[PDB]
Amino acid sequence: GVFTFEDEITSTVPPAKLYNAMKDADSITPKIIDDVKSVEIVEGNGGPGTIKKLTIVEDGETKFILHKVESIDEANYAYNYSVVGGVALPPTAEKITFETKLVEGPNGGSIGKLTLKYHTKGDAKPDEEELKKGKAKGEGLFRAIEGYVLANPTQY
Ligand code: NA
Numbered sequence: 001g002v003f004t005f006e007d008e009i010t011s012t013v014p015p016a017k018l019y020n021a022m023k024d025a026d027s028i029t030p031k032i033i034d035d036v037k038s039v040e041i042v043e044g045n046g047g048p049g050t051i052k053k054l055t056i057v058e059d060g061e062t063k064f065i066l067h068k069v070e071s072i073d074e075a076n077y078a079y080n081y082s083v084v085g086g087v088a089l090p091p092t093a094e095k096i097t098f099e100t101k102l103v104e105g106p107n108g109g110s111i112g113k114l115t116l117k118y119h120t121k122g123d124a125k126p127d128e129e130e131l132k133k134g135k136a137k138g139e140g141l142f143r144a145i146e147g148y149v150l151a152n153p154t155q156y
Pocket of ligand 1 (some may be wrong): 029030031032033034035036037
């Protein structure tokens with residue numbers, strides 16, 4: 001099954017900047033996110049379809065996560081990817097999709113929508129703690145991109 005969740009968020013950073021820095025996540029994320037050590041392309045140019053392998057360290061053990069770039073839409077300031085391999089996918093989870101879409105906010109900032117789509121196998125529903133972790137991870141990546149923009153204003 002597919003179980004979709006949406007959270008609304010806010011940022012002081014304008015949406016064009018945030019969108020441009022989302023597309024630089026491969027380089028931003030391992031600097032800012034401690035446990036993210038590297039992101040390499042397995043196949044593709046970085047566009048929709050691209051498979052990426054992330055190396056992380058959790059509890060001082062090296063682990064690997066697989067991401068697929070799903071879609072990137074400048075007209076909706078939208079950047080979308082899926083976890084398709086590694087720790088976040090227990091046996092009844094087939095894939096977890098993270099979408100981020102941005103609109104113009106008040107005061108030169110942004111309103112964000114974070115969508116999490118949790119694809120289960122068969123009639124399985126998503127586990128509630130998994131959901132909770134999925135949501136935290138999604139919000140974390142967003143704040144990492146945001147934090148980077150805020151701390152490095154001349155780059156965007
Ligand atoms: Na890191």
